[PDB]
Enzyme design. Structure first.
Site, short mmCIF file in Angstrom:
data_model
loop_
_atom_site.label_atom_id
_atom_site.label_comp_id
_atom_site.label_asym_id
_atom_site.label_seq_id
_atom_site.Cartn_x
_atom_site.Cartn_y
_atom_site.Cartn_z
N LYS A 105 -12.10 0.22 3.08
CA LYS A 105 -11.53 1.57 3.18
C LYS A 105 -11.99 2.24 4.46
O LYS A 105 -13.19 2.26 4.77
CB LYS A 105 -12.07 2.44 2.06
CG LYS A 105 -11.52 2.20 0.70
CD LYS A 105 -12.48 2.97 -0.19
CE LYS A 105 -12.09 2.89 -1.62
NZ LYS A 105 -12.21 1.47 -2.05
N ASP A 139 -7.37 -1.15 3.21
CA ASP A 139 -6.90 -0.68 1.91
C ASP A 139 -6.30 0.71 2.06
O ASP A 139 -6.82 1.53 2.83
CB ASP A 139 -8.05 -0.63 0.91
CG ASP A 139 -8.48 -2.02 0.44
OD1 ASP A 139 -7.88 -3.04 0.85
OD2 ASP A 139 -9.46 -2.07 -0.34
N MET A 140 -5.20 0.99 1.35
CA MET A 140 -4.58 2.31 1.52
C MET A 140 -5.19 3.29 0.54
O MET A 140 -5.22 3.05 -0.66
CB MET A 140 -3.04 2.28 1.41
CG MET A 140 -2.36 3.54 2.02
SD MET A 140 -2.63 3.75 3.80
CE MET A 140 -1.06 3.32 4.46
N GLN A 169 2.11 1.50 -0.53
CA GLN A 169 2.17 1.91 -1.92
C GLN A 169 3.59 2.30 -2.28
O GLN A 169 4.18 3.20 -1.67
CB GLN A 169 1.27 3.13 -2.13
CG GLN A 169 -0.26 2.85 -1.97
CD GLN A 169 -0.99 4.03 -1.37
OE1 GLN A 169 -0.41 4.83 -0.63
NE2 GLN A 169 -2.27 4.15 -1.68
N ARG A 190 0.23 -5.97 2.26
CA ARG A 190 -0.02 -6.00 0.84
C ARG A 190 0.80 -4.87 0.20
O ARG A 190 0.73 -3.72 0.62
CB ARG A 190 -1.53 -5.85 0.49
CG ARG A 190 -1.77 -5.83 -1.00
CD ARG A 190 -3.16 -5.27 -1.39
NE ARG A 190 -4.24 -6.12 -0.87
CZ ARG A 190 -5.46 -5.66 -0.55
NH1 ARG A 190 -5.75 -4.36 -0.67
NH2 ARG A 190 -6.37 -6.51 -0.09
N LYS A 193 1.65 -0.73 -6.14
CA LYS A 193 2.29 0.49 -6.66
C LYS A 193 1.58 1.75 -6.20
O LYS A 193 2.23 2.75 -5.89
CB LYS A 193 2.37 0.47 -8.18
CG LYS A 193 3.16 -0.68 -8.78
CD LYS A 193 3.31 -0.54 -10.26
CE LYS A 193 4.03 -1.78 -10.85
NZ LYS A 193 4.13 -1.77 -12.36
N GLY A 194 0.24 1.71 -6.18
CA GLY A 194 -0.59 2.81 -5.72
C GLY A 194 -1.53 3.26 -6.82
O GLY A 194 -1.13 3.36 -7.97
N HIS A 233 -0.18 -6.86 -11.28
CA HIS A 233 -0.43 -7.64 -12.49
C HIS A 233 0.78 -7.56 -13.44
O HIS A 233 0.76 -8.11 -14.54
CB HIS A 233 -1.65 -7.08 -13.24
CG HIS A 233 -2.87 -6.92 -12.37
ND1 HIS A 233 -3.36 -5.69 -11.98
CD2 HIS A 233 -3.68 -7.85 -11.79
CE1 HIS A 233 -4.44 -5.87 -11.23
NE2 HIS A 233 -4.64 -7.17 -11.09
#
Ligand code: FAD
Ligand code: FAD
EC number: 1.5.5.2
Lengths: 300, 292
Positions: A105, A139-140, A169, A190, A193-194, A233
């Site tokens: 991050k 990473d967002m 996202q 990548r 969904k967020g 997932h």
């Protein structure tokens, strides 16, 4: 907080989880009697446990994303200390005969304090990572941090780095435009969904639309020829992406599936046996408890 | 769905059909213009007065012979000739099977070509309605052939429930197709069509957005308010002008939304059936939605 007449359920749950986890006795209990449960989702407190966990995944046909956990950075010194942890991981990954992939991050490299600082520290990480074949994912984080994340991604791409990727996202209205804007960068993506709580004004409140946007953006990125990691997932979404890539003749070398360590591990293995590239996202470090508190406090 | 079963099962009785025809004329006229072309043009005038456009859809019994196919084509030619000189936008819909598609592709092409020859000089747009999945390939063949012969005022329908649709869309891009996007009306097996409604709806949004970003004219033919709200949001946010897409509804279905969208400056059309064989269509409008 109430929400349109009735108690805010999402807030109530979160606050309860947090309140129960912060209780000294509950924390002692979990660290003592729930170690088997924790190591399922968290490699351990050390880089050595994390590297062992990655070797165990590799034995099974599954690749590792190593994610160093730390208390939230609030000072330049703490951002530098965190960067040191990242460098140690890159160097330790250097020897390894398997795909080397780390996630970080930007706030943990001091983004909120100084964007210039964050870029500086990130470039030094990339300098070590790039020649060693260590891939670095940005990473967002939450919606106020998107512009700076893309800005730093573009800056590093333009300085010659290629072992760096972004996360987009699907719940944000802005994501399709960000995707189309980034096309010249041929980004390694990548798709998620967020994870954050975002207002109606910036993110789809409807889970059907979030999932619909995921599939639309995934398909758009694929048709564009972008390398895409489907970090999800969701079995409906996975099944559709398998059907779609097969029907469109998209090679297995142009996309992958990513799962959190310990989540649907039978699926991770199954997808791998089917010839897909699968990664498990593997957290590690001394700050695992607040981290897992937060992932539990996300949704009931 | 117990409601759907009941209405469908009672609709076929001859005394129910007679009661509807004499005592539920207001119900019939809500969803069908009438039996005659004249009533259909009056219905299109009434829509136009409220800012809504008409798609005129000739209904006839199922075509089974070359003679029936030509009779149906004559009906459509009568429609095309009648639309000539009407001030407002002229748009007709047809099924290729009613032009004898199952009898011969050559027949349907010959009949359709004559319709487009009369249509285009008169400013009449012709939509080829999409039928079930065994008929898609022939339909795209006739479309492409007619385009290559120089016709332009002809459109296609793509259905989001089919797996093959995205590739069809992509394959068709060089044609710059004028597109109506629908969910799809037929029972299709899981081998050909998304079984899950969440996926049909997701695919609808995906194809629509893909079509718009390719700069194609797209007609969104859907009553789904979740989908309409999202397409409205998306077109605004992406700066797509109101003259690059439209919304289409069945005649009498969400008529207040039709007027509301017209008032907000959107292109809206209602799909207006007319003809002698209107009772089956009307049955399906009552059945599909708990009504009254
Ligand atoms: C590798 C990886 C990296 C990520 N990186 C980021 C990031 O940088 N930024 C960000 O905002 N988010 C990130 N995310 C998180 C993502 O945004 C989602 O919050 C998270 O993946 C859960 O959503 P989902 O797609 O699994 O579907 P959800 O809608 O949460 O779940 C829908 C379906 O998925 C299945 N499922 C979900 N969770 C579980 C579970 N714990 N156990 C069993 N089944 C489950 C269930 O069958 C469920 O019905 C990342 C996720 C992963 C896996
Ligand atoms: C102008 C037009 C042309 C078409 N052409 C073709 C074609 O060529 N080929 C083909 O296969 N299909 C065609 N279709 C039909 C389409 O494929 C669908 O079967 C049909 O439109 C129903 O799906 P839907 O998107 O309206 O929503 P559905 O999925 O049926 O409904 C979703 C939501 O929409 C709302 N809704 C639906 N009906 C109503 C109502 N009466 N009142 C209030 N809310 C309602 C409900 O909230 C519902 O939950 C056409 C449809 C239209 C309207």
């Amino acid at each position: 907080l109430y929400f349109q007449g009735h108690m805010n359920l999402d807030l109530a749950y979160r606050s309860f989880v947090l309140g129960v986890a912060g209780h000294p006795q509950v924390e002692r209990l979990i660290k003592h009697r729930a170690k088997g449960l924790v190591r399922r989702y968290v490699a351990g407190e050390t880089l050595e446990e994390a590297l062992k966990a990655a070797e165990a995944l590799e034995r099974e046909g599954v690749h590792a994303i190593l994610d160093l956990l730390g208390e939230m950075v609030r000072t330049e010194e703490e951002a530098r200390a965190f960067q040191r942890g990242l460098l140690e991981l890159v160097w330790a990954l250097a020897g390894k005969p398997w795909p080397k992939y780390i996630s970080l991050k930007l706030t943990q490299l001091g983004l909120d304090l100084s964007e210039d600082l964050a870029l500086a520290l990130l470039r030094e990480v990339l300098r070590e990572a790039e020649p060693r074949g260590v891939f670095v994912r940005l990473d967002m984080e939450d919606s106020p941090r998107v512009e700076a994340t893309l800005r730093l991604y573009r800056a590093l791409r333009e300085e010659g780095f290629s072992q760096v990727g972004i996360v987009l996202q699907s719940y944000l209205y802005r994501t399709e435009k960000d995707l189309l804007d980034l096309l010249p960068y041929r980004p390694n993506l990548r798709l998620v969904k967020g994870a954050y709580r975002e207002p109606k004004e910036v993110a789809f409140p409807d889970k059907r639309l979030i999932d619909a946007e995921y599939l639309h953006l995934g398909k758009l990125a694929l048709k564009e020829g972008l390398y895409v990691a489907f970090a999800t997932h969701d079995p409906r979404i996975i099944a559709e992406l398998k059907r779609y890539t097969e029907a469109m003749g998209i090679p297995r070398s142009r996309f992958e599936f990513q799962f959190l360590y310990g989540v649907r591990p039978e699926e991770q293995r199954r997808l791998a046996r089917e010839g897909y590239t699968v990664r498990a996202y593997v957290p590690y470090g001394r700050d695992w408890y607040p981290y897992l508190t937060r992932r539990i406090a996300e949704r009931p």
